[PDB]
């Protein structure tokens, strides 16, 4: 699957996608790939 190596992808038991980016150190509930 095509995914930039900076995008550390994790999924919450709530059924939510949640990002943790290694460069900016950011946590986003918004997935840019899902749209």
């Amino acid at each position: 699957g095509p995914l930039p190596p900076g995008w550390e992808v994790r999924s919450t038991v709530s059924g939510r996608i949640y990002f943790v980016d290694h460069n900016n150190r950011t946590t986003q509930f918004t997935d840019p790939r899902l749209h």
């Binding site: 994790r10 919450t12 990002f19 946590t27």
Partner: peptide
């Protein structure tokens, strides 16, 4: 976002 506060950025998240 409009969602609850996301999980604090831990470098390597194992859940």
């Amino acid at each position: 976002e409009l969602e609850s506060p996301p999980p604090p950025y831990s470098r390597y998240p194992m859940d």
